[PDB]
Amino acid sequence: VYLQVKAISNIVWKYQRYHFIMAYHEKPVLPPPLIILSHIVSLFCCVCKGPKLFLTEEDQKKLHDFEEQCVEMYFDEKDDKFNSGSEERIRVTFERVEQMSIQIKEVGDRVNYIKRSLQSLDS
Amino acid sequence: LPITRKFYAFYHAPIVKFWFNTLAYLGFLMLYTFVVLVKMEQLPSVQEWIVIAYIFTYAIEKVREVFMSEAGKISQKIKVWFSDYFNVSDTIAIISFFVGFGLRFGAKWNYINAYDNHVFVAGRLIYCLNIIFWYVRLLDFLAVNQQAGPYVMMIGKMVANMFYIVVI
Amino acid sequence: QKSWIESTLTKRECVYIIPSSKDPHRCLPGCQICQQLVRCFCGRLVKQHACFTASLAMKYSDVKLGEHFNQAIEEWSVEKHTEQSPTDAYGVINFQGGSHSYRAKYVRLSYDTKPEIILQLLLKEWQMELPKLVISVHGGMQKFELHPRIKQLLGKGLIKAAVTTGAWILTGGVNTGVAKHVGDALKEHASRSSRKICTIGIAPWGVIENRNDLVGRDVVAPYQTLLNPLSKLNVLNNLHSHFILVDDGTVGKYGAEVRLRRELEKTINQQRIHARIGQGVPVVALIFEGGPNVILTVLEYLQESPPVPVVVCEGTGRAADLLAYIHKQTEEGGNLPDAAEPDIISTIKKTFNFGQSEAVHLFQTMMECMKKKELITVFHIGSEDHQDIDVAILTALLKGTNASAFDQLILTLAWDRVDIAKNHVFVYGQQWLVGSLEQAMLDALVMDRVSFVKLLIENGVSMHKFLTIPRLEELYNTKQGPTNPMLFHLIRDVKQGNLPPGYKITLIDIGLVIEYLMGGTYRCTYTRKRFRLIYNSLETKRFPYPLNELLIWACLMKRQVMARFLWQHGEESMAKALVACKIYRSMAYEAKQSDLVDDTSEELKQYSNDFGQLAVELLEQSFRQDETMAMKLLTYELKNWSNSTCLKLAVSSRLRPFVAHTCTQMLLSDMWMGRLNMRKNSWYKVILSILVPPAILMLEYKTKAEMSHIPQSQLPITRKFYAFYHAPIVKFWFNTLAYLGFLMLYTFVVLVKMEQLPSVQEWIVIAYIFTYAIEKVREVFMSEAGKISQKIKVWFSDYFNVSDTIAIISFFVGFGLRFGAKWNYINAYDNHVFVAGRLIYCLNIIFWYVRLLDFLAVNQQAGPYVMMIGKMVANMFYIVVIMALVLLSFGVPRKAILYPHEEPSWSLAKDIVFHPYWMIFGEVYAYEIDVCANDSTLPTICGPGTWLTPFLQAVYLFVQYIIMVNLLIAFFNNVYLQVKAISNIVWKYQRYHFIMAYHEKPVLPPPLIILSHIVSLFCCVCKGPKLFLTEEDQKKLHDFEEQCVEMYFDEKDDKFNSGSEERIRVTFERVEQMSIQIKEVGDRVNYIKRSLQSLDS
């Protein structure tokens, strides 16, 4: 247990940090002996009279446009990382060297057709 | 920024509400520790009254934290809030305290000794056990620190998963 | 409204319905065909007008006179007979069917929109960035062919020009023209690949195929992109990103766009290309297979002020190739000197069916275009000029526009293209006015353009004459590059108060930051009185070593790529790396100790470790090259770095691999042994010779030939004694033997009964501590030169110096009470002033036992264990806090239940902690657990509720004894494993500290040290590893260092280039090229065999 938690220790506290920041954001300004005033004064203002952003439909559309751009950039970087990897470079090289070996035999075949045809025009 | 808005800004800041709740909680425990270690009389000492007031108003606070929580069904609100450890512990701590206070306070004294009356003794002994809940709730305050917090999560995971070794 | 597109823009409609260019039409249905096929000049048939009035022109009669005179037939215009109104067609195209169904914003607006409104649309509404170039692609507006090679040879280059610069490409948009082939460039080469191109297509609205679909307020209109591939129809190319569809209120006529496009070109060329750069955004024209009118458009640019260059391509045998033909014919001045007009007039008509008349007039245009052949450029693909059309489009802005050398340079800087600046700007011919390269350097430094800073230094810029106090302050105060938010807060901390709002940073304030970050006794030049008496006044306003100052700048500004570049240039390279490590290390600590939760500290820590590793790797280069000069690098006084050494700087950063390096250890060994030269068994040879002084003569001593290099250095009978006792190894054992004798006596004093007057043992003990105290006072004041406040802070940064301070003060409090106590009593323990003093001694002796750990840490095995223990105790706090809460959670209920009749007392404090603490160590107090049992040792405690406490203690021990103690042990085990992994490194770093400590100490230990004191301060009134080089050997050492920096990068490059990953990739890229070269054989082999079949006949 020690070794498991210690390995992710900073991650653990940063997650805990969400819970206590949210907890004390919602609490009133007085602690529990004197909180009664915060109670007795608040419920008057409701009868007598957390981290959430309420966007308008226009900025809502800009944010979606921002998000889709970053999704595109995510896949681009993913593809570039993949295509730069050594395994992907060995295999494309592998497939490409194979093709060339036929293309050279396709020269080594046609070079005959030249030299033998030259021997035909030699006469 | 004028003078009056600087006070508003301070006290409504969550870091301030933390330390202000923390300092009041420590003062609460120091008094309640005094109450259980010092001889208990017929009527609560001024220390004990302050202790009672804290737990009562802390309880009202917890009731309001549930009902002014994330909008939903009351049954859902209840299930969520009893999914935390310290909220289950605080619930037991609050209920047991007022069982203890009722016995301590509503006990008729047939005797001058005050420990011959076993309704009174039952109430005092509940306090002495109830105070454990309130010391252990300090682990939650201490887990606000970057170093202490992971150790607190360690202990919880140790206790939660050791059952079958202890059965053996 | 709150809608800028709709509120501002305008759509025209033809309110007015003259017949179709003459009498309506024949065909006996007469009034009936007036519905079928009778249009306006507007371009729309009767029912396509659809205006509110044009529909009253569908009922009874039209909006005109009885027979409508002919100077009203001509009177229709798109200015007087079209009603402006808010727009309808705008949004995002969805090119459904095209390869992920591309997206492109669009809008319908009139030809008369003010040019600023356009600019607002492009930049504000569409959130486009102001570009650094504008390529305007003109060409043939009719479906045309393009050879396969040139296709993939154009789309490689126009794309790079718009991708390496953020250029707006401009087209017509519709596929009937050149826009179709701009799309080919985009499709191939994966146009942007996360690196946006903005290609606007300004088309007229009255020709767009499927005009209807685009109609709609902010609508995502889809759009068929698969019509017949041959049929020439005005269909928007699905690979552009933006469209400005110019309205003139009509249908079926082009020519409404010609102005708005040019007006946009003016509007962009009057915008600053960058904050500092005071040019306009460049514009350039590109020509792909132009029609007739494209020729005039060329001339239309060449005249206007400022002109616009025109890069004409080749291929296809029209306006593009034609201008390429005559551009090789006309002379340098611009008039065909030969008589060859009818031959080129012949060529005009082979491409443009005129016959004679327009042919010459077409030729008349060009001879004026051939006047300004400096603003014209031909990129011919055959003999391959310019190596690329990218550089061609870009270079066209550089030649022919009679731009200053500066303006040529700075535009490449904005673009971030050195390859063009190196090859085309820095060349014989430029003249370079007085301070143009320097102003270029400032822009490049500010803008973090490392590649140009390199180029400028190579091509004639002296940083010595460049870098001044004002220019250096401009660099600290800029916001036009990578910045460090922390720096402003560090200045606010060293300036105790706050600042006026537009505070510009001062170098004195930087100096105060550097002293804060370097710490110890570091003193920056900027804080010294000389620099101040200069700075307050502002050959003298320059710096002798500018590259030192800019390295500091780049690191404080968190400009790491620039800092790595400025490191490898200039002198003092190892020092600069070690200073950089310390600066970043200290900034990392400040970030870590802040209330902010971010990644700044790990980033700065990494940067420190980067320079720390450079310093270690440089030391290894130097050591392998020349050990003696490597050791000199460690030890030469750094005049420019607070008179320090590179070893001291590395120690300031806890840079253990540098200190643990063999070169440093060899240096330290020579100091430790001094003139002694025993290789084996030195510890007891020294001990027995301290105790038997004649054995000093049996020892081995270094010859002066050996004690000659020793790059930190500062046989008869008498000099052998001097050599021995002044050796730090000897001063260690001599202090160690005296310390052990001290403790043995003081142990005796506290264990044996104390009388009125101190025993002789106690007097010796007193003398030791008193003189040891004088020694510590002198170690502080004769420490590293600095402010007394700095000297104090440094010395109280060690643990054993804080402990010794408490140990010394407490002893003399204890002695004063022990000694100045009047004895009213014979018993001597009735007097409680005396007892207080004795008890202080008994506690003070603990300090002196624990100080033996420091002596023992001189051994290679024991030392790391001592560091382990310190790290265990220092970091266990929060586990012990939890243990304390668990303790009280049990202690308080136990006492309350078992002792319910207590009044308040401080015994309650003891009772709630005492037994619970001893339980941690396994004392269960077995016969006290159940107080009501027969075998209980507390039978009187039996009472109500006392049966609860065994359950409480059961839980307590499980949590405390099993969980919490073993968590603490688990933490200690990690400390062990961490330190053990680096154990030899740990001791070698410790070795620096004790060799330095005993090098500075005197030759007598603390009882007899008083003589060394009393004799030394006479010689000052009456009458450490630092090499003081002369300026000539100082220059040789710098030459040695720069050679080893070069060898460092060479080996780094060779290692990199030999790596398998680098070999796979170069192979990958190289096999790709060969596959074209073989297809280039496989293509040409045909040309052979088929040509042989041609000569076969």
Ligand SMILES: CCCCCCCC/C=C/CCCCCCCC(=O)O[C@@H](COC(=O)CCCCCCCCCCCCCCC)COP(=O)([O-])OCC[N+](C)(C)C
């Ligand atoms: C990181 C850490 C940061 C720092 C954290 C710091 C935490 C700060 C926390 C701080 C507050 C600590 C104080 C609490 C304990 C006091 C007990 C005590 O000493 O009692 C004594 C003092 O006399 C009284 O207590 C009389 C007053 C009665 C009411 C109690 C108010 C005390 C103040 C609390 C105000 C409310 C606070 C809480 C609100 C919920 C009485 O004992 P006695 O006179 O010996 O008994 C007579 C015996 N006889 C009968 C034999 C004669």
Ligand SMILES: CCCCCCCC/C=C/CCCCCCCC(=O)O[C@@H](COC(=O)CCCCCCCCCCCCCCC)COP(=O)([O-])OCC[N+](C)(C)C
């Ligand atoms: C989501 C929320 C989370 C937190 C939970 C929140 C809810 C927490 C709920 C807490 C309540 C839990 C139940 C307690 C019941 C008391 C039992 C008891 O001792 O009875 C005794 C006293 O009974 C009396 O009625 C006299 C005592 C006064 C009442 C004090 C308790 C009520 C206050 C509660 C305030 C709670 C505040 C809640 C505010 C929200 C009966 O016996 P006796 O009279 O002693 O017998 C004498 C015999 N003899 C004479 C022979 C000797």
Ligand SMILES: CCCCCCCC/C=C/CCCCCCCC(=O)O[C@@H](COC(=O)CCCCCCCCCCCCCCC)COP(=O)([O-])OCC[N+](C)(C)C
């Ligand atoms: C009065 C008696 C109770 C208190 C105990 C006093 C004794 C000493 C022990 C102290 C332990 C507590 C240390 C932390 C608090 C100090 C400041 C601190 O670091 O705060 C932290 C939060 O702090 C908390 O979350 C503390 C919550 C209160 C815990 C109270 C019970 C602890 C004792 C249990 C009872 C048993 C033991 C005691 C015996 C009874 C925040 O710190 P920071 O500066 O934001 O973060 C630093 C890192 N930075 C640089 C990256 C930002």
Ligand SMILES: CCCCCCCC/C=C/CCCCCCCC(=O)O[C@@H](COC(=O)CCCCCCCCCCCCCCC)COP(=O)([O-])OCC[N+](C)(C)C
């Ligand atoms: C890797 C390791 C390497 C090896 C490490 C080896 C370390 C080498 C260290 C070596 C030195 C160790 C000696 C110190 C302890 C002596 C105590 C003692 O025995 O006292 C006794 C001897 O008689 C005296 O002590 C009388 C002399 C008084 C002054 C003390 C000087 C002693 C010599 C030290 C010179 C200064 C040295 C320090 C300078 C700062 C007195 O006791 P008593 O007679 O029984 O009492 C009478 C009782 N009665 C009253 C009932 C009759």
Ligand SMILES: CCCCCCCC/C=C/CCCCCCCC(=O)O[C@@H](COC(=O)CCCCCCCCCCCCCCC)COP(=O)([O-])OCC[N+](C)(C)C
């Ligand atoms: C960077 C440096 C690091 C190390 C720190 C270096 C500095 C270390 C500093 C150390 C000094 C610390 C303060 C000591 C104060 C003594 C207090 C005391 O006991 O007072 C008592 C004696 O007071 C007297 O004046 C009589 C005793 C003689 C003086 C002996 C102490 C001074 C020597 C210090 C030599 C220090 C050597 C420093 C050399 C540099 C007063 O009370 P009383 O008289 O006992 O009362 C009798 C009452 N009755 C009669 C009813 C019974």
Ligand SMILES: CCCCCCCC/C=C\CCCCCCCC(=O)O[C@@H](COC(=O)CCCCCCCCCCCCCCC)COP(=O)([O-])OCC[N+](C)(C)C
């Ligand atoms: C005064 C003397 C008399 C009294 C003495 C009595 C003896 C002592 C009695 C009790 C000791 C107190 C602890 C009780 C059990 C803890 C529950 C638990 O494990 O929660 C954990 C899991 O599980 C749950 O969250 C749900 C399980 C509990 C059910 C809900 C309570 C129902 C009523 C009661 C029935 C339940 C059993 C108790 C009934 C007795 C919650 O973990 P967490 O904290 O959420 O972790 C993540 C936190 N985070 C989200 C911030 C990341």
Ligand SMILES: CCCCCCCC/C=C\CCCCCCCC(=O)O[C@@H](COC(=O)CCCCCCCCCCCCCCC)COP(=O)([O-])OCC[N+](C)(C)C
């Ligand atoms: C969820 C809430 C549930 C509980 C609600 C409350 C229910 C009501 C609870 C209690 C009411 C008790 C009233 C008295 C009953 C009749 C007996 C009597 O009068 O006297 C007897 C009382 O004997 C006892 O044991 C009294 C204490 C019982 C409580 C036991 C712990 C339960 C609470 C734990 C916490 C649970 C909370 C858990 C938290 C989730 C003896 O005393 P006496 O007569 O004065 O003396 C005669 C002997 N003499 C002659 C030697 C002197």
Ligand SMILES: CCCCCCCC/C=C\CCCCCCCC(=O)O[C@@H](COC(=O)CCCCCCCCCCCCCCC)COP(=O)([O-])OCC[N+](C)(C)C
């Ligand atoms: C009077 C005596 C002194 C007082 C005692 C000292 C005070 C007590 C000390 C510590 C109390 C607990 C600290 C809580 C820390 C937070 C934990 C949390 O958030 O949730 C945790 C639950 O946590 C628990 O369940 C807590 C322990 C339950 C009560 C048992 C106490 C120990 C006694 C019994 C021992 C005695 C046995 C022998 C008996 C003879 C959740 O963790 P998890 O579920 O493991 O996480 C899995 C995550 N997963 C989803 C990836 C799988």
Ligand SMILES: CCCCCCCC/C=C\CCCCCCCC(=O)O[C@@H](COC(=O)CCCCCCCCCCCCCCC)COP(=O)([O-])OCC[N+](C)(C)C
């Ligand atoms: C006789 C009976 C009466 C007396 C009983 C007294 C009871 C016991 C009292 C005290 C026990 C003695 C230890 C005290 C604390 C140690 C400080 C520390 O942690 O240092 C460490 C860090 O921290 C510092 O270096 C600075 C922290 C201390 C501040 C400076 C002292 C100010 C005055 C005093 C205020 C401070 C607290 C003390 C005040 C009481 C230093 O570590 P280091 O060794 O540098 O590690 C690297 C070594 N290297 C560089 C070679 C690689």
Ligand SMILES: CCCCCCCC/C=C\CCCCCCCC(=O)O[C@@H](COC(=O)CCCCCCCCCCCCCCC)COP(=O)([O-])OCC[N+](C)(C)C
């Ligand atoms: C930084 C320096 C600070 C300290 C400077 C020095 C300050 C001066 C210090 C002390 C001066 C004391 C002089 C006497 C005071 C008046 C009382 C008196 O005379 O008698 C009383 C003395 O009672 C005591 O307790 C005396 C000892 C006090 C010292 C307590 C520890 C502080 C030093 C710890 C180390 C701190 C160092 C930490 C290191 C950083 C009783 O004795 P009596 O009258 O003979 O007997 C009458 C009773 N009878 C009738 C039964 C016989």
Ligand SMILES: CCCCCCCC/C=C\CCCCCCCC(=O)O[C@@H](COC(=O)CCCCCCCCCCCCCCC)COP(=O)([O-])OCC[N+](C)(C)C
């Ligand atoms: C009379 C009894 C017998 C005597 C006792 C035996 C003698 C005492 C034995 C050992 C004393 C210490 C040895 C020092 C070794 C050198 C360390 C050094 O150089 O600096 C170290 C500080 O080191 C400390 O702070 C030392 C410990 C402080 C004093 C507390 C002693 C233990 C008591 C409390 C325990 C009781 C608790 C429970 C109480 C009930 C620095 O290490 P660091 O800062 O961790 O390094 C971090 C590096 N980083 C920058 C990468 C992050």
Ligand SMILES: C[C@@H]1CC[C@@]2(OC1)O[C@H]1C[C@H]3[C@@H]4CC=C5C[C@@H](OCCC(CO)CO)CC[C@]5(C)[C@H]4CC[C@]3(C)[C@H]1[C@@H]2C
């Ligand atoms: C977070 C932690 C919660 C627990 C705790 O720490 C903090 O809270 C503290 C409160 C303390 C008590 C406050 C007041 C007194 C009165 C005093 O009476 C004078 C003496 C008398 C002699 O006869 C005069 O005549 C005696 C001491 C006592 C009972 C304290 C004891 C320790 C206690 C219980 C502490 C306990 C360890």
Ligand SMILES: Oc1ccc2c3c1O[C@H]1c4oc5ccccc5c4C[C@@]4(O)[C@@H](C2)N(CC2CC2)CC[C@]314
């Ligand atoms: O590890 C080292 C390996 C080789 C050398 C050293 C080392 O460390 C030094 C050290 O340490 C000692 C400890 C005890 C006895 C002798 C020495 C010495 C010796 C020495 O002086 C020496 C050679 N040269 C000067 C000589 C001119 C070359 C300098 C460096 C030196």
